[PDB]
mmCIF file of all heavy atoms in Angstrom:
data_model
loop_
_atom_site.group_PDB
_atom_site.id
_atom_site.type_symbol
_atom_site.label_atom_id
_atom_site.label_comp_id
_atom_site.label_asym_id
_atom_site.label_seq_id
_atom_site.Cartn_x
_atom_site.Cartn_y
_atom_site.Cartn_z
ATOM 1 N N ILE A 1 -7.275 5.001 -7.136
ATOM 2 C CA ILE A 1 -8.109 4.262 -8.072
ATOM 3 C C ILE A 1 -8.962 5.157 -8.965
ATOM 4 O O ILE A 1 -9.282 4.765 -10.091
ATOM 5 C CB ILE A 1 -8.986 3.259 -7.309
ATOM 6 C CG1 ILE A 1 -8.113 2.357 -6.440
ATOM 7 C CG2 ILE A 1 -9.800 2.425 -8.272
ATOM 8 C CD1 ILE A 1 -8.859 1.208 -5.819
ATOM 9 N N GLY A 2 -9.343 6.350 -8.515
ATOM 10 C CA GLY A 2 -10.381 7.033 -9.259
ATOM 11 C C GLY A 2 -10.326 8.527 -9.501
ATOM 12 O O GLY A 2 -11.271 9.063 -10.085
ATOM 13 N N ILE A 3 -9.276 9.233 -9.079
ATOM 14 C CA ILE A 3 -9.212 10.677 -9.257
ATOM 15 C C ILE A 3 -7.936 11.131 -9.954
ATOM 16 O O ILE A 3 -7.980 12.043 -10.786
ATOM 17 C CB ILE A 3 -9.410 11.428 -7.927
ATOM 18 C CG1 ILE A 3 -8.403 10.979 -6.880
ATOM 19 C CG2 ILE A 3 -10.826 11.233 -7.421
ATOM 20 C CD1 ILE A 3 -8.855 11.330 -5.488
ATOM 21 N N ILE A 4 -6.785 10.549 -9.622
ATOM 22 C CA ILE A 4 -5.552 10.962 -10.290
ATOM 23 C C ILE A 4 -5.609 10.537 -11.752
ATOM 24 O O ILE A 4 -5.659 9.343 -12.070
ATOM 25 C CB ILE A 4 -4.314 10.396 -9.582
ATOM 26 C CG1 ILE A 4 -4.408 8.884 -9.411
ATOM 27 C CG2 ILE A 4 -4.121 11.058 -8.232
ATOM 28 C CD1 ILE A 4 -3.453 8.346 -8.375
ATOM 29 N N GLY A 5 -5.618 11.518 -12.652
ATOM 30 C CA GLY A 5 -5.766 11.270 -14.069
ATOM 31 C C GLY A 5 -7.199 11.222 -14.555
ATOM 32 O O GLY A 5 -7.424 11.026 -15.760
ATOM 33 N N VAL A 6 -8.172 11.394 -13.655
ATOM 34 C CA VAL A 6 -9.572 11.344 -14.056
ATOM 35 C C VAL A 6 -9.898 12.482 -15.010
ATOM 36 O O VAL A 6 -10.710 12.314 -15.930
ATOM 37 C CB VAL A 6 -10.486 11.345 -12.814
ATOM 38 C CG1 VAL A 6 -10.570 12.721 -12.188
ATOM 39 C CG2 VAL A 6 -11.869 10.854 -13.184
ATOM 40 N N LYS A 7 -9.252 13.636 -14.835
ATOM 41 C CA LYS A 7 -9.433 14.748 -15.761
ATOM 42 C C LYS A 7 -8.985 14.365 -17.162
ATOM 43 O O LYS A 7 -9.687 14.628 -18.144
ATOM 44 C CB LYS A 7 -8.657 15.964 -15.266
ATOM 45 C CG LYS A 7 -9.087 17.267 -15.895
ATOM 46 C CD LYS A 7 -10.108 17.955 -15.022
ATOM 47 C CE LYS A 7 -9.777 17.749 -13.558
ATOM 48 N NZ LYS A 7 -10.809 18.358 -12.684
ATOM 49 N N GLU A 8 -7.826 13.717 -17.270
ATOM 50 C CA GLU A 8 -7.323 13.317 -18.578
ATOM 51 C C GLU A 8 -8.210 12.260 -19.220
ATOM 52 O O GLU A 8 -8.491 12.335 -20.422
ATOM 53 C CB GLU A 8 -5.889 12.813 -18.458
ATOM 54 C CG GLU A 8 -4.875 13.912 -18.223
ATOM 55 C CD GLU A 8 -4.731 14.262 -16.759
ATOM 56 O OE1 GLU A 8 -5.423 13.637 -15.932
ATOM 57 O OE2 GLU A 8 -3.925 15.157 -16.436
ATOM 58 N N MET A 9 -8.664 11.273 -18.443
ATOM 59 C CA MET A 9 -9.497 10.224 -19.025
ATOM 60 C C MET A 9 -10.826 10.789 -19.507
ATOM 61 O O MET A 9 -11.299 10.462 -20.603
ATOM 62 C CB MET A 9 -9.747 9.102 -18.022
ATOM 63 C CG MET A 9 -11.148 8.532 -18.154
ATOM 64 S SD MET A 9 -11.476 7.140 -17.079
ATOM 65 C CE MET A 9 -10.712 7.746 -15.596
ATOM 66 N N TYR A 10 -11.445 11.652 -18.703
ATOM 67 C CA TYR A 10 -12.741 12.176 -19.100
ATOM 68 C C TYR A 10 -12.610 13.203 -20.214
ATOM 69 O O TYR A 10 -13.530 13.350 -21.024
ATOM 70 C CB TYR A 10 -13.456 12.750 -17.883
ATOM 71 C CG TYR A 10 -14.181 11.680 -17.105
ATOM 72 C CD1 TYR A 10 -14.150 11.651 -15.722
ATOM 73 C CD2 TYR A 10 -14.876 10.679 -17.763
ATOM 74 C CE1 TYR A 10 -14.808 10.665 -15.019
ATOM 75 C CE2 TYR A 10 -15.534 9.696 -17.069
ATOM 76 C CZ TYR A 10 -15.496 9.691 -15.701
ATOM 77 O OH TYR A 10 -16.154 8.704 -15.013
ATOM 78 N N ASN A 11 -11.477 13.901 -20.298
ATOM 79 C CA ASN A 11 -11.238 14.762 -21.449
ATOM 80 C C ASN A 11 -11.055 13.942 -22.716
ATOM 81 O O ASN A 11 -11.520 14.335 -23.791
ATOM 82 C CB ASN A 11 -10.019 15.644 -21.200
ATOM 83 C CG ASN A 11 -10.308 16.766 -20.238
ATOM 84 O OD1 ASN A 11 -11.323 16.755 -19.544
ATOM 85 N ND2 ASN A 11 -9.417 17.746 -20.187
ATOM 86 N N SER A 12 -10.364 12.805 -22.613
ATOM 87 C CA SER A 12 -10.203 11.933 -23.771
ATOM 88 C C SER A 12 -11.543 11.384 -24.231
ATOM 89 O O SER A 12 -11.828 11.333 -25.432
ATOM 90 C CB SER A 12 -9.242 10.795 -23.440
ATOM 91 O OG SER A 12 -9.223 9.837 -24.480
ATOM 92 N N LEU A 13 -12.388 10.971 -23.286
ATOM 93 C CA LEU A 13 -13.696 10.442 -23.656
ATOM 94 C C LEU A 13 -14.691 11.541 -24.001
ATOM 95 O O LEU A 13 -15.778 11.235 -24.500
ATOM 96 C CB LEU A 13 -14.256 9.575 -22.534
ATOM 97 C CG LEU A 13 -13.459 8.317 -22.205
ATOM 98 C CD1 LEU A 13 -13.933 7.725 -20.897
ATOM 99 C CD2 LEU A 13 -13.580 7.312 -23.325
ATOM 100 N N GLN A 14 -14.351 12.803 -23.741
ATOM 101 C CA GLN A 14 -15.214 13.941 -24.057
ATOM 102 C C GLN A 14 -16.510 13.916 -23.255
ATOM 103 O O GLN A 14 -17.568 14.296 -23.759
ATOM 104 C CB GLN A 14 -15.519 14.011 -25.553
ATOM 105 C CG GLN A 14 -14.319 14.349 -26.409
ATOM 106 C CD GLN A 14 -14.677 14.509 -27.869
ATOM 107 O OE1 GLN A 14 -15.829 14.332 -28.259
ATOM 108 N NE2 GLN A 14 -13.689 14.847 -28.686
ATOM 109 N N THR A 15 -16.445 13.467 -22.007
ATOM 110 C CA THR A 15 -17.626 13.480 -21.160
ATOM 111 C C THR A 15 -17.579 14.683 -20.219
ATOM 112 O O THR A 15 -16.495 15.118 -19.822
ATOM 113 C CB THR A 15 -17.721 12.195 -20.349
ATOM 114 O OG1 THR A 15 -17.015 12.363 -19.117
ATOM 115 C CG2 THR A 15 -17.100 11.049 -21.115
ATOM 116 N N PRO A 16 -18.730 15.238 -19.845
ATOM 117 C CA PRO A 16 -18.748 16.424 -18.977
ATOM 118 C C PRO A 16 -18.416 16.079 -17.533
ATOM 119 O O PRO A 16 -19.220 15.479 -16.811
ATOM 120 C CB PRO A 16 -20.185 16.940 -19.130
ATOM 121 C CG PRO A 16 -20.970 15.766 -19.545
ATOM 122 C CD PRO A 16 -20.066 14.905 -20.361
ATOM 123 N N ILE A 17 -17.212 16.464 -17.108
ATOM 124 C CA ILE A 17 -16.818 16.286 -15.710
ATOM 125 C C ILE A 17 -17.737 17.022 -14.740
ATOM 126 O O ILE A 17 -18.011 16.479 -13.657
ATOM 127 C CB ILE A 17 -15.340 16.677 -15.527
ATOM 128 C CG1 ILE A 17 -14.483 15.977 -16.577
ATOM 129 C CG2 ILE A 17 -14.868 16.305 -14.140
ATOM 130 C CD1 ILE A 17 -13.023 16.319 -16.486
ATOM 131 N N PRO A 18 -18.185 18.254 -15.011
ATOM 132 C CA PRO A 18 -19.216 18.850 -14.147
ATOM 133 C C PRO A 18 -20.485 18.027 -14.054
ATOM 134 O O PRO A 18 -21.095 17.982 -12.980
ATOM 135 C CB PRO A 18 -19.480 20.210 -14.804
ATOM 136 C CG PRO A 18 -18.202 20.551 -15.441
ATOM 137 C CD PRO A 18 -17.606 19.260 -15.920
ATOM 138 N N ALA A 19 -20.902 17.370 -15.137
ATOM 139 C CA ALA A 19 -22.048 16.472 -15.051
ATOM 140 C C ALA A 19 -21.746 15.283 -14.152
ATOM 141 O O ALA A 19 -22.601 14.861 -13.363
ATOM 142 C CB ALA A 19 -22.455 16.002 -16.445
ATOM 143 N N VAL A 20 -20.536 14.729 -14.258
ATOM 144 C CA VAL A 20 -20.168 13.589 -13.420
ATOM 145 C C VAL A 20 -20.150 13.988 -11.950
ATOM 146 O O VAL A 20 -20.531 13.203 -11.072
ATOM 147 C CB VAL A 20 -18.811 13.015 -13.864
ATOM 148 C CG1 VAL A 20 -18.448 11.818 -13.014
ATOM 149 C CG2 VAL A 20 -18.853 12.634 -15.326
ATOM 150 N N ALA A 21 -19.706 15.210 -11.659
ATOM 151 C CA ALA A 21 -19.674 15.675 -10.275
ATOM 152 C C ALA A 21 -21.078 15.784 -9.694
ATOM 153 O O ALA A 21 -21.320 15.384 -8.549
ATOM 154 C CB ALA A 21 -18.952 17.017 -10.190
ATOM 155 N N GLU A 22 -22.020 16.321 -10.470
ATOM 156 C CA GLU A 22 -23.396 16.410 -9.997
ATOM 157 C C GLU A 22 -24.007 15.025 -9.834
ATOM 158 O O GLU A 22 -24.798 14.786 -8.911
ATOM 159 C CB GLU A 22 -24.226 17.257 -10.958
ATOM 160 C CG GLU A 22 -25.673 16.833 -11.046
ATOM 161 C CD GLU A 22 -26.499 17.380 -9.902
ATOM 162 O OE1 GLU A 22 -25.904 17.786 -8.883
ATOM 163 O OE2 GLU A 22 -27.742 17.403 -10.020
ATOM 164 N N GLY A 23 -23.651 14.098 -10.725
ATOM 165 C CA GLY A 23 -24.093 12.724 -10.559
ATOM 166 C C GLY A 23 -23.583 12.104 -9.273
ATOM 167 O O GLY A 23 -24.304 11.368 -8.598
ATOM 168 N N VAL A 24 -22.333 12.400 -8.913
ATOM 169 C CA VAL A 24 -21.792 11.901 -7.651
ATOM 170 C C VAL A 24 -22.512 12.538 -6.470
ATOM 171 O O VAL A 24 -22.772 11.882 -5.455
ATOM 172 C CB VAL A 24 -20.275 12.145 -7.578
ATOM 173 C CG1 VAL A 24 -19.761 11.807 -6.193
ATOM 174 C CG2 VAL A 24 -19.560 11.321 -8.626
ATOM 175 N N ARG A 25 -22.831 13.830 -6.578
ATOM 176 C CA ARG A 25 -23.513 14.522 -5.486
ATOM 177 C C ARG A 25 -24.907 13.956 -5.248
ATOM 178 O O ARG A 25 -25.360 13.852 -4.099
ATOM 179 C CB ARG A 25 -23.589 16.016 -5.786
ATOM 180 C CG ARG A 25 -24.378 16.807 -4.767
ATOM 181 C CD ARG A 25 -24.054 18.283 -4.868
ATOM 182 N NE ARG A 25 -23.461 18.616 -6.157
ATOM 183 C CZ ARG A 25 -22.336 19.301 -6.309
ATOM 184 N NH1 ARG A 25 -21.654 19.747 -5.268
ATOM 185 N NH2 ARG A 25 -21.886 19.545 -7.536
ATOM 186 N N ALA A 26 -25.611 13.597 -6.324
ATOM 187 C CA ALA A 26 -26.910 12.949 -6.166
ATOM 188 C C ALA A 26 -26.772 11.615 -5.442
ATOM 189 O O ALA A 26 -27.620 11.252 -4.615
ATOM 190 C CB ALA A 26 -27.569 12.756 -7.529
ATOM 191 N N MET A 27 -25.704 10.874 -5.744
ATOM 192 C CA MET A 27 -25.423 9.640 -5.020
ATOM 193 C C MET A 27 -25.191 9.914 -3.541
ATOM 194 O O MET A 27 -25.633 9.140 -2.686
ATOM 195 C CB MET A 27 -24.215 8.937 -5.635
ATOM 196 C CG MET A 27 -24.465 7.493 -6.005
ATOM 197 S SD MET A 27 -23.200 6.825 -7.093
ATOM 198 C CE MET A 27 -21.748 7.033 -6.076
ATOM 199 N N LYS A 28 -24.505 11.015 -3.222
ATOM 200 C CA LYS A 28 -24.311 11.398 -1.827
ATOM 201 C C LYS A 28 -25.640 11.663 -1.140
ATOM 202 O O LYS A 28 -25.850 11.262 0.009
ATOM 203 C CB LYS A 28 -23.441 12.647 -1.723
ATOM 204 C CG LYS A 28 -23.494 13.227 -0.325
ATOM 205 C CD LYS A 28 -23.398 14.736 -0.311
ATOM 206 C CE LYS A 28 -22.593 15.231 0.875
ATOM 207 N NZ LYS A 28 -22.166 16.634 0.671
ATOM 208 N N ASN A 29 -26.538 12.372 -1.824
ATOM 209 C CA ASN A 29 -27.836 12.684 -1.230
ATOM 210 C C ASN A 29 -28.640 11.418 -0.962
ATOM 211 O O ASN A 29 -29.205 11.245 0.128
ATOM 212 C CB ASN A 29 -28.615 13.631 -2.139
ATOM 213 C CG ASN A 29 -28.015 15.017 -2.175
ATOM 214 O OD1 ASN A 29 -27.258 15.399 -1.285
ATOM 215 N ND2 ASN A 29 -28.346 15.779 -3.207
ATOM 216 N N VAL A 30 -28.666 10.502 -1.931
ATOM 217 C CA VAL A 30 -29.409 9.256 -1.755
ATOM 218 C C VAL A 30 -28.789 8.414 -0.645
ATOM 219 O O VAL A 30 -29.497 7.769 0.135
ATOM 220 C CB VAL A 30 -29.484 8.475 -3.075
ATOM 221 C CG1 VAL A 30 -30.298 7.215 -2.882
ATOM 222 C CG2 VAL A 30 -30.092 9.338 -4.160
ATOM 223 N N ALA A 31 -27.456 8.404 -0.559
ATOM 224 C CA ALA A 31 -26.792 7.634 0.486
ATOM 225 C C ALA A 31 -27.068 8.212 1.866
ATOM 226 O O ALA A 31 -27.347 7.471 2.814
ATOM 227 C CB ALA A 31 -25.288 7.579 0.224
ATOM 228 N N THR A 32 -27.002 9.538 1.998
ATOM 229 C CA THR A 32 -27.251 10.164 3.290
ATOM 230 C C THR A 32 -28.715 10.059 3.687
ATOM 231 O O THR A 32 -29.043 10.175 4.872
ATOM 232 C CB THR A 32 -26.816 11.625 3.263
ATOM 233 O OG1 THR A 32 -27.403 12.275 2.130
ATOM 234 C CG2 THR A 32 -25.306 11.723 3.169
ATOM 235 N N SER A 33 -29.604 9.843 2.722
ATOM 236 C CA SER A 33 -30.995 9.567 3.051
ATOM 237 C C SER A 33 -31.191 8.249 3.796
ATOM 238 O O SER A 33 -32.242 8.068 4.419
ATOM 239 C CB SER A 33 -31.842 9.560 1.777
ATOM 240 O OG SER A 33 -32.894 8.617 1.875
ATOM 241 N N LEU A 34 -30.224 7.330 3.757
ATOM 242 C CA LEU A 34 -30.376 6.007 4.351
ATOM 243 C C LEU A 34 -29.497 5.802 5.580
ATOM 244 O O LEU A 34 -29.271 4.658 5.984
ATOM 245 C CB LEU A 34 -30.070 4.922 3.321
ATOM 246 C CG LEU A 34 -30.814 4.976 1.989
ATOM 247 C CD1 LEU A 34 -30.074 4.155 0.949
ATOM 248 C CD2 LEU A 34 -32.237 4.482 2.147
ATOM 249 N N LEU A 35 -28.995 6.874 6.186
ATOM 250 C CA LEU A 35 -28.067 6.740 7.298
ATOM 251 C C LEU A 35 -28.462 7.665 8.438
ATOM 252 O O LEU A 35 -29.096 8.703 8.230
ATOM 253 C CB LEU A 35 -26.627 7.047 6.877
ATOM 254 C CG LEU A 35 -25.939 6.014 5.991
ATOM 255 C CD1 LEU A 35 -24.520 6.448 5.685
ATOM 256 C CD2 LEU A 35 -25.950 4.657 6.665
#
């Protein structure tokens, strides 16, 4: 659902994949704060 071709989609949209990765990591930190 979310990784195969994600490089191509985000390159087409011209969004920073490294920024998206850090955004996901922050979500991991907030989630692990509640478990």
Side-chain angles (χ1 to χ4, degrees):
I1 305 189
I3 56 199
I4 53 198
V6 75
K7 197 94 37 183
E8 287 86 0
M9 144 176 43
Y10 276 138
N11 285 15
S12 172
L13 297 167
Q14 292 184 358
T15 89
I17 310 179
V20 181
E22 148 81 342
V24 172
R25 175 162 20 231
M27 233 165 60
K28 167 214 217 163
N29 290 340
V30 182
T32 51
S33 146
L34 307 161
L35 288 181

